[PDB]
Amino acid sequence: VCSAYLHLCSRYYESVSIYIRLKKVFNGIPAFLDKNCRKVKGEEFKKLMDMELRYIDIKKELNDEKAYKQLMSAIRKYVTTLTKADSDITYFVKQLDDEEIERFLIDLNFFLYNGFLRITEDKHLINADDVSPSYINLYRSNNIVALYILKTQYEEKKTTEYYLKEYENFVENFQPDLHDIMKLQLFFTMAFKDCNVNQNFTETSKKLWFDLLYAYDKFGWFYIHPNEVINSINKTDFVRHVLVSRNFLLKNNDQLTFLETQVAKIVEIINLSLDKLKLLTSYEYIDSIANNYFFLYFNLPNIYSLAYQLFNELAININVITNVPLKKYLKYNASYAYFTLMNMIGKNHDIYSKGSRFVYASYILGLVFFIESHIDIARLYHKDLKTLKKNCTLLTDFMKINKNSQNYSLTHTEEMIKILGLLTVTLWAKEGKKSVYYDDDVSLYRKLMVSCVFNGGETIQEKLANNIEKSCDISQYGIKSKNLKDMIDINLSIHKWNPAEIEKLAYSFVLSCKMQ
């Protein structure tokens, strides 16, 4: 497969690479003793590591105490040989002092046989899942020198072909065995245990996933270019960003995959319900889907609540840099969220939390974070209208993917991202199975901001102002000047909203123009 279920194959090949590299290390280690420490344990090392037919013990078996201070010394020398040219991890490697080396040499032998991880932690907080090999189940079983090794060594149909093949070639220059194939089969059957979970994924949404990924890793197509992200971190704040990111991706790791699949579902439904003139970008069509979220089985938990919960977790993590609630200054501090977003969609550096690649979740969660930290007032009238205009232009200027110089012809991926943005904005204000223009209990602010977004720019007031002074005709016995305009706008804000005012003023002044 590896093409329909993107994520299950992405989970399989990580385990394959880990097994291959650790087996390479453990098959390179034995020949090392036949070169230094001429007769410490030269050959019977493998005969003790046999484990064929067993449990393990190097103390009771081999009951010659004048063996540790040389065996473990040679082993530590080997491990510090592997982690060379870094001059920082070597310090922590020389300070090991077995049996923090014996435990490694036993757990690494237990992993390369039965493909498990040899868990001896609290055996009620693990559920038949925290045993498969991956970079996270190794930072949770106290296997940390293994990560030192994997960090020092082996570390730095067009788009589909590129990403899938041209870089999932760890298996090159490798050969299977009579054994060693059963462990690959075990990894595979571990990965694909969700035979219906992680549902719809095919050329419908698969193509969009690969297009967004390739666009980010080639041109930098995100809500904010990564160069700007990096160019705002002054030198002496970089070691805490890494810690605010690493902890968000370790603990909230299953909710991110859940949100990923839930966004894939709605992209499937969008492409399955079917042009860009105003259909797919008008209010009523998108409102149909926004109604699809209230009442594939039509349950579909709201994907704004999930992103809001993750925003809550991120905003709690960010507050580790001070000891005050940080109420309205969550902005001016969004560099943390943006570093996390880069690490979540891009190539994840810092191999202690490396996992999946979370393409959709990044777009949705970054939009939600921006909305909830900049463009909201629910938790804090002419100048109020100035503030509406300022926030609306900030929002509409944030949501544009490509900016610099290329011509704006709206390729398909840009269309799909625009549709996702408008759905996320019409889920922010909707409060039931009823269009949010005709409902009460929706704030004055939210109807106006939704209208200001769907028209891409100006306002709901200045639009009609330009449209009416187009038929300049009206200048009767009578009045024009922004005065009459703000008169009609307060008429709006008092009478009732929203399209009632739009259509009724439209036609009243159509008949006014045909009057004079």
């Binding site: 932690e121 609290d122 009620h124 907080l125 693990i126 559920n127 930072y139 949770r140 079983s141 106290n142 810690l243 902890n247 370790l250 603990k251 790791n253 299953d254 709690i316 993590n317 507050n319 580790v320 000891n323």
Partner: protein, 97 residues
């Protein structure tokens, strides 16, 4: 639980009253405090990671699979998660007063 606390304090009072060739009445309090700190640090696990310790605490959580556990083990989990960080501070107060 003011029925086991009484027994523990009585035991410690006896141990102190019988050994005054050690325990100069300010070494007993320090010794008890360090014993409580060891009783506390015997609670920390690698799951619910290291730096998730004090670190201007906002990194603290319970477990990756807190839910799905049970209706009665996931309160023992609350007790362990709290005691892993706040056992010496709140036990030493009662003991010393």
């Amino acid at each position: 639980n003011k029925e086991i606390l009484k027994e523990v304090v009585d035991e410690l009072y006896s141990i102190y009253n019988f050994n005054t060739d050690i325990f100069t009445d300010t070494s007993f309090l320090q010794t008890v405090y360090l014993l409580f700190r060891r009783i506390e640090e015997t609670y920390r696990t690698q799951r619910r990671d290291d730096k998730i310790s004090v670190n201007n605490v906002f990194f603290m959580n319970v477990a990756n699979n807190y839910s799905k556990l049970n209706k009665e083990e996931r309160e023992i989990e609350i007790h362990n998660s709290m005691a892993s960080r706040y056992y010496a501070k709140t036990m030493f107060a009662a003991f010393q007063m």
